[PDB]
Each structure stands twice: as C-alpha cells, then as structure tokens.
Amino acid sequence: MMSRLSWGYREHNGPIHWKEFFPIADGDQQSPIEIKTKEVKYDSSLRPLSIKYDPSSAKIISNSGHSFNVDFDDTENKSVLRGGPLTGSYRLRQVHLHWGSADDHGSEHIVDGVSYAAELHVVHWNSDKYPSFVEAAHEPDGLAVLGVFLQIGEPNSQLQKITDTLDSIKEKGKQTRFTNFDLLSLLPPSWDYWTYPGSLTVPPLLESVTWIVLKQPINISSQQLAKFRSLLCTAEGEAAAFLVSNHRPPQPLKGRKVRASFH
Ligand SMILES: NS(=O)(=O)c1c(F)c(F)c(SCCO)c(F)c1NC1CCCCCCC1
Ligand SMILES: [Zn+2]
C-alpha cells in the first residue's frame, strides 16, 4: 500500500498517491515539467556549462528499488558541474534512469508534447555551501541535475558498462563495484539546454534542484531499454515485482518560467 517508506510506481503506491505522504508533491516548484518552447526565452546571462568528470569517481552501482543508482566519490572535486545557471561548484553524486513500460513514452520532461523513451538524471550538489548531499538537498540552491533524453535509435555502446551489471543487481538492495565509468561520453554532442527551478522527481520531492535539461537526445535500442525493465522493485525474499515503469508525470509550472541556453 502507499506509505511514507513504501512509495513506488505500482497502482497503490505510485505517483498519484505520493501526495498522501509528501504533500510537497502538489507544490509550486515540482518536477518534471512540460517545456513549451514558444514561451521559453534565451538568456544571454547564462555562462558556458563546464563538465569536468573523472571516470575513477564512480564507485558502486545498486538497485534502489526505484532505478539503478551509480554512486560517485563525492569527497573531492574531481567530478564537478559548473557554469550555466549555477553559482559555485556542484559535485557529482549519482546517476540514475527513468523509463516507461513501453518505448513510446517514459521520459520525465516532455518538450512540446514530445516524450522520449527514457531519461537519465545526473545529480550534483553544492559543496561550496553545504557540508553533504543530504544537507544540500534541503536548500533551494543545493542541487543541480542534468537531464538527458534517450530516444529509441541504434544501440548505444556507452550503455554497456551499465547493462552488463543489471543481472547482478536484479533485486532491490543489491550492489556491485562500478568504477572507471565514462559518464561524459553518455552526454549528447550538443549541450544546449533548458533550465528552471524544480524538485527531486521521487519522494521526498524536495524543491532544491536547478534543472538543466539537455535538448539533444542520446540513443538507446529497444533491446537495451527492455533490460532495465527486468530489474525488480522488490528485495530478496519479497514477492517479486518488476520495475517496468519508473517515471513521474510532468507537474504544472505554476508561474515558473523556463530559460534557454541557446537561440
Ligand atoms: N545519496 S542519497 O541516498 O541521500 C540520494 C541521492 F544520492 C540522490 F541522487 C537522490 S536524487 C533522486 C533519487 O534518485 C536522492 F533522492 C537521494 N536520497 C534522498 C533521501 C532522503 C534523505 C534526505 C535527502 C534527499 C535525498
Ligand atoms: Zn531522477
């Protein structure tokens, strides 16, 4: 059933039920959103984006029950996001992915009505101001998240390191060592983006995120994507259930405006 500790994406515990235990779900700065490009303005004051990523920063991949999570050594500043809308240095913490039960939709953000098959989130936190991820996640300027769309297309070799691990992390709670990960090369060639203030897209739905949603999708094949749907949302010894869909619908803008890095 729905509860604070048992949210998910199934019928009784899914997105439409999260407000029962996390009433910020219906807040003013929730994510994801629909981006209406005719109402987006270019902002010349955005600085160039800076992405410095060290493959050795990756440590572990795990099944959270809600996605896979690649966790990074966030003790140093070897892997950091700077520039764009951001003030100061945002340290890489996590990568995870959202998908739907079928290829036609599953992205979280939706651009002029267009959905993609999946969406990668790359989570960073403001280590110039805050002492930990966990503390940054409660501040409006605390987190910076890159969103990358995945469109069905020819298989993507850059996803192999991830897909090779999925059997080892089938059950919720399993983890496996995962280092030397080339994240940079899972970004599209163009880093043109939209930016707006929003939230985590899972409980606790905290309104602490500067979203940076890249316009250009990367590819994934249907065969590759289907492997993610074979992860379980359930732990060893719990009746099995598959994580066939794990995307939150867009939430209303409720007055926020979205800026473009490009014109
Ligand atoms: N490292 S962590 O487990 O704290 C964590 C991430 F690394 C993340 F990148 C995120 S982003 C959305 C989930 O995938 C996260 F929510 C949490 N968890 C939330 C847990 C509730 C505790 C307070 C802080 C909010 C983050
Ligand atoms: Zn996410």
Q: 89 near 138, Cβ under 8 Å?
A: no
The 3-state secondary structure of the chain reads CCCHHHCCCCCCCCHHHHHHCCHHHHCCCCCCCEECHHHCEECCCCCCEEEECCHHHEEEEEECCCCEEEEECCCCCCCEEEECCCCCCEEEEEEEEEECCCCCCCCCCEECCECCCEEEEEEEEECCCCCCHHHHCCCCCCEEEEEEEEEECCCCHHHHHHHCCHHHHCCECCEEECCCCCCHHHCCCCCCEEEEEECCCCCCCCCCEEEEEECCCEEECHHHHHHHCCCECCECCCCCCECCCCCCCCCCCCCCCCEECCC
66 belongs to the catalytic site: yes
**Containing domain of residue 14, as a range?**
1-263
Query: Is residue 121 a known part of a binding site?
Result: yes
CATH number of domain containing 201: 3.10.200.10
> CB within 5 A of ion ligand 2: which residues?
121, 201
Any ligand 1 atom below 6 A from CB of 133? yes
Q: How was this structure determined?
A: X-ray
How many domains does one find in the chain? 1
What is the experimental resolution, given in Å to one decimal place?
A: 1.1
CA 46 / ligand 2 centre spacing (Å): 24
Any ligand 1 atom below 6 A from CB of 234? no
